[PDB]
């Protein structure tokens, strides 16, 4: 299909959509949609007592990927920073102390790239790399 559209299996040329957040803890995002059009923007805001790290405003690109970096609302109380949840992914594990771990899976047909499991190390850094749920097309 042309740029910004993806086909039915193999080869209807449907429009690409970027994935919505499964959750955005201790903050909100606007507009709140089930998926986002190419060129659409999502803006993130944190509640009181939280630090917004990552990109406050992100745009959906023609290959169905968001630009910028995963936004997260961090209270700074963990041994490691809040690792966030990249858009399209679901995470399990909500403790960010030394030795704790989180696990990530993607949703629908999204292909996980990066570390599906990450541990909070001694120097305050999460092990591995951030998982990114890529579109199967492109």
């Amino acid at each position, epitope marked *: 299909c042309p740029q910004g559209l993806y086909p039915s299996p193999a080869s209807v040329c449907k429009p690409v959509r970027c994935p919505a957040p499964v*959750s955005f803890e201790n903050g*909100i995002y*606007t*507009p*709140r949609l*089930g*998926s986002y*059009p190419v060129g659409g*923007n999502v803006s993130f*805001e944190c509640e009181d007592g939280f630090i917004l790290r990552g990109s406050p405003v992100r745009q959906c690109r023609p290959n169905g990927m968001w630009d910028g970096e995963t936004a997260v609302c961090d209270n700074g109380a963990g041994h490691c920073p809040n690792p966030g949840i990249s858009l399209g992914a679901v995470r399990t594990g909500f403790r960010f102390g030394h030795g704790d771990k989180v696990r990530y899976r993607c949703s629908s047909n999204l292909v996980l790239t990066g570390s599906s499991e990450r541990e909070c190390q001694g120097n305050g850094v999460w092990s591995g790399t951030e998982p990114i749920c890529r579109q199967p097309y492109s």
Partner: antibody
Amino acid sequence: EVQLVQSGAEVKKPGASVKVSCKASGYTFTDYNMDWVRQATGQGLEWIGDINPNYESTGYNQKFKGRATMTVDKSISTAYMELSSLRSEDTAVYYCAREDDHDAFAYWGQGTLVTVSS
Amino acid sequence: DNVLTQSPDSLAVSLGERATISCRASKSVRTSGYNYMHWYQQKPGQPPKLLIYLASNLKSGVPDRFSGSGSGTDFTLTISSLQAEDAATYYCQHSRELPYTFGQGTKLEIKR
């Protein structure tokens, strides 16, 4: 084009539960959340909650106090709203409503009357 | 929660004349360069119908005698030339945060 078709009217006793269905057609179901909104007679519109079919993740109006449960069945493009511990004040017309890319409710179901009474 | 207050609660307008309805939000609905306020029309026995999105944009198929304006917290819906089919209740709604909330509704009737 896009159509949202709800289940029929219900009558329930106080303390009971009701489950309303909303079948969607004419678009890719997983592109959009499904929302639920209610209206008592001669009264205003109240948002209940939403569900994202991609994740089955939900958001709720806190005023309902966990009494509302939203689910989907993607295989048949249907969303459900279950409201438990019903009170007579829950008597209303219940709508499913679907956002557009501006987060406005561009599409609505026809409404389902739920009457809660002894 | 954001409270939307519409005024007047009802109004009678002669056919052909201008009708204006106001919506005031207790919190700003503006963020990221857009005003997340939408307007709907509702007639008896029917769901609401979306007329105006993001304060001032007409939905396709809506006659251009309808228009919207405002920013921040104060918004207006105008019908430049009231026609008989425009008698209805109008509602504003924000999509700035959760919960989504609606104004209480303004009933527009025909003056005689």
